[PDB]
Design an enzyme around this catalytic site. Structure first.
Site, PDB file in Angstrom:
ATOM      1  N   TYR A   1     -14.436   0.890  -3.149  1.00  0.00           N
ATOM      2  CA  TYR A   1     -12.593  -0.174  -2.411  1.00  0.00           C
ATOM      3  C   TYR A   1     -12.315  -1.026  -3.624  1.00  0.00           C
ATOM      4  CZ  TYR A   1      -9.271  -1.444   0.377  1.00  0.00           C
ATOM      5  OH  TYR A   1      -7.708  -1.483   1.107  1.00  0.00           O
ATOM      6  N   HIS A   2     -10.604  -1.190  -4.496  1.00  0.00           N
ATOM      7  CA  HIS A   2     -10.038  -1.552  -4.839  1.00  0.00           C
ATOM      8  C   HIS A   2     -11.124  -1.423  -6.191  1.00  0.00           C
ATOM      9  CE1 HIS A   2      -9.156  -4.868  -1.827  1.00  0.00           C
ATOM     10  NE2 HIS A   2      -8.047  -4.016  -2.179  1.00  0.00           N
TER      11      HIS A   2
ATOM     12  N   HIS B   1      -5.505   1.225  -5.887  1.00  0.00           N
ATOM     13  CA  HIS B   1      -5.771   1.601  -4.428  1.00  0.00           C
ATOM     14  C   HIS B   1      -6.041   3.632  -4.533  1.00  0.00           C
ATOM     15  CE1 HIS B   1      -5.234  -1.976  -3.273  1.00  0.00           C
ATOM     16  NE2 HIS B   1      -5.804  -2.010  -2.100  1.00  0.00           N
TER      17      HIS B   1
ATOM     18  N   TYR C   1       0.845  -1.294  -0.157  1.00  0.00           N
ATOM     19  CA  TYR C   1       0.120  -0.246   0.213  1.00  0.00           C
ATOM     20  C   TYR C   1       1.210   0.948   0.015  1.00  0.00           C
ATOM     21  CZ  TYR C   1      -4.448  -2.422   0.427  1.00  0.00           C
ATOM     22  OH  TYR C   1      -5.635  -3.041   0.867  1.00  0.00           O
TER      23      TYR C   1
HETATM   24 CU   LIG Z   1      -6.562  -3.551  -0.973  1.00  0.00          CU
END
Ligand SMILES: [Cu+2]
Ligand SMILES: [Ca+2]
Length: 638
Positions: free
Chosen positions: A494-495, A580, A272
């Protein structure tokens, strides 16, 4: 799992027709409500006719169709699973137009879906172009069609969504392959999940915009599960994918040979983190506590020596947010931009902005706080940041939330104007902020310098599709104004990812990747901006770049082009990579054109490679009506 976006249409009055059916596996067994009966095309002694195979549903009346689902045969036999496919809609039954969805479904017996923008129709046709394992047959145990509560024509002038691209994976990371124009996507060790990975494998898929074909393959050669990585296109034209589920591995994607090559291990295990290409073509990274453990200071990748070198005095502490979950989240997804003389600007998400330096063992200098006359901007985890005018140092930042999860997003948006490294940039509020507060949204800069902003949700709950934002926005810098565009129907939170395509349209996809959840989106959609349409809503005629003097240029170098009509503006847009909410590769250079007469124009690529970052770029030209050409690919070297 996955899910339809609509509600199932009653199948009592339905009539179906198939190209071929085996006795006892009749076409109508696909709509009988029995999971143990399936339609199966002809097989055995008298022949095995190969695909395409077709099933056409006459629903009898016009319904507001927004999807279909296919339940494969449930008897443990794989024969007839649908691979490549197309979905068509009609009101008369003779004219089908273009598919509303097309792509390839993963080879297994799970329920498959095609979700697409609402369109009134009485007939629904599914074409199975290939069987998932290359065999002759098609089978379906149950086919369902889904409807929205209503239909509303798209508003003129506000762009259009569609078609849907059906995929065999959730594309939670993606990049444009600049030498081929294909979209490269990957998930994790499996198509729908990252949890419980043993490492060493990533599933990938690609889509070719010119043909509509989707493929898929399994990357193991680099022994790297590339979920949750840093991504940067380095100056040697290779995509550096760093860390993630295999927290110290590096994999290099080479567009020219369409292949993955092992890279050196990072010095620090990370996930991340953001990484950013630098003015010299190297890649800087910092942070990333999703995996690997301690403070994750900077390090730098050199494509020429094939090494990662620690920059321990490029301290991560000044860029940490105040995330309630602490270190696990607080160094994630930095808003990094390569800049002049090897520096990297960190615009957020923390309130504190910083200059990162790569000489020696690294350094960091405070650049002040992101703020305006409305106050100091709060931490904006999973907000976006886009460099829409690299020549003037302009960055638009927007959205996000103070914490990674369980936090309300905001409408905050700022314009940051970079000068020299080490100086505190001017920051102002952007117009009156976003129309819709959002986090986990994605964004791309468009040829005309506007920024397209889409998806997200109002309260960040990773893997849940609650409080979704379906209306995208475009920021137009010349007016310092945001404009709502036509809404889509698929949650992209998300994603999810967005990328600018060489043809000037936007590819928006993924969301989910949570295994047994129902919120996995095995698909993407195209957004076509209004600048591709004329006043009657038909696709406009586009200017053509008939010739360029060269396709590879050094910073400060000149390029001459010839067009088939006069052009009013031009821009270079660096090819993008996305995961992300992070895309540190895209950026835009507006070009100052010399009119040579006779629809011939010349321009200089900026001489500072901190502005014109080395790598691949899209050249777009625009006519007087504002319509852009398709991109010409230009390699910029330093
Ligand atoms: Cu993720
Ligand atoms: Ca059945």
């Amino acid at each position: 799992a996955s899910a339809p976006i609509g509600v199932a249409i009653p199948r009592n009055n339905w009539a179906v027709t198939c190209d071929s059916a085996q006795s006892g596996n009749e076409c109508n067994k696909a709509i009988d409500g029995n999971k143990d009966t399936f339609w199966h095309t002809q097989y055995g002694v008298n022949g095995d006719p190969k695909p395409p195979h077709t099933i056409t549903i006459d629903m009898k009346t016009v319904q507001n169709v927004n999807g279909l689902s296919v339940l494969p045969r449930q008897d443990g036999n794989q024969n007839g699973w649908i691979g490549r496919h197309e979905v068509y809609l009609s009101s008369d039954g003779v004219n089908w137009g273009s598919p509303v969805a097309s792509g390839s479904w993963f080879a297994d017996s799970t329920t498959k879906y095609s979700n697409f923008e609402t369109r009134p129709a009485r007939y629904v046709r599914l074409v199975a172009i290939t069987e998932a394992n290359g065999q002759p047959w098609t089978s379906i145990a149950e086919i369902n069609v889904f409807q929205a509560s209503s239909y509303t024509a798209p508003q003129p002038g506000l762009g259009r969504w569609g078609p849907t691209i059906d995929l065999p994976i959730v594309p939670s990371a993606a990049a444009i392959e600049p030498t081929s124009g294909r979209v490269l996507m990957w998930s994790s060790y499996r198509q729908d999940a990252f949890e419980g990975s043993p490492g060493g494998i990533t599933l990938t898929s690609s889509w070719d915009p010119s043909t509509g074909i989707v493929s898929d393959r399994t990357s193991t050669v680099t022994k790297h599960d590339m979920f949750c990585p840093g991504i940067s296109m380095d100056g040697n034209g290779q995509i550096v994918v760093s860390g993630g589920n295999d927290a110290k591995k590096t994999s290099l994607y080479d567009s020219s040979s369409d292949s993955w090559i092992p890279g050196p291990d990072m010095q620090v295990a990370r996930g991340y983190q953001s990484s950013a290409t630098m003015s010299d073509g190297r890649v800087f990274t910092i942070g990333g506590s999703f995996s690997g453990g301690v403070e994750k200071n900077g390090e730098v990748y050199s494509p020429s020596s094939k090494t990662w070198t620690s920059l321990p005095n490029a301290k991560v502490n000044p860029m940490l947010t105040a995330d309630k979950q602490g270190l696990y989240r607080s160094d994630n997804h930095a808003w990094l931009f390569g800049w002049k003389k090897g520096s990297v600007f960190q615009a957020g998400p923390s309130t504190a902005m910083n200059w990162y330096y790569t000489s020696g063992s690294g350094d960091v200098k405070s650049a002040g706080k992101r703020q305006s006359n409305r106050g100091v901007a709060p931490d904006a985890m999973c907000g976006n940041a886009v460099m829409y005018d690299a020549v003037k140092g302009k960055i638009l930042t927007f959205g996000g939330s103070p914490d990674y999860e369980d936090s309300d997003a905001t409408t905050n948006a700022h314009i940051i104007t970079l000068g020299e490294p080490g100086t505190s940039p001017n920051t102002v509020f952007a117009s009156n902020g976003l129309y819709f507060a959002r986090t986990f949204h994605t964004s791309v800069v468009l040829p005309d310098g506007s920024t397209f902003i889409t998806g997200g949700q109002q309260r960040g709950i990773p893997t849940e599709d609650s409080t979704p934002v379906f209306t995208p926005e475009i920021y137009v810098p010349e007016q310092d104004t945001f404009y709502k565009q036509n809404p889509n129907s698929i949650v992209r939170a998300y994603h999810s990812i967005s990328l600018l395509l060489p043809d000037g349209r936007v590819f928006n996809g993924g969301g989910g990747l949570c295994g047994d959840c129902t919120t996995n989106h095995f698909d993407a959609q195209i957004f076509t901006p209004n600048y591709l349409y004329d006043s009657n809503g038909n696709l406009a005629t586009r200017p053509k770049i008939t010739r360029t003097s060269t396709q590879s240029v050094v910073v400060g170098g000149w390029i001459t082009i010839w067009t088939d009509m006069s052009i009013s503006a031009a821009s270079l847009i660096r090819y993008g990579t996305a995961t992300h909410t992070v895309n540190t590769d895209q950026r835009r250079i507006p070009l100052t054109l010399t009119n040579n007469g006779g629809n011939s124009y010349s321009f200089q690529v900026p001489s500072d490679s901190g502005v014109a970052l080395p790598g691949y770029w899209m050249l777009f030209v625009m006519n007087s009506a504002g319509v852009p050409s398709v991109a010409s690919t230009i390699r910029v070297t330093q």
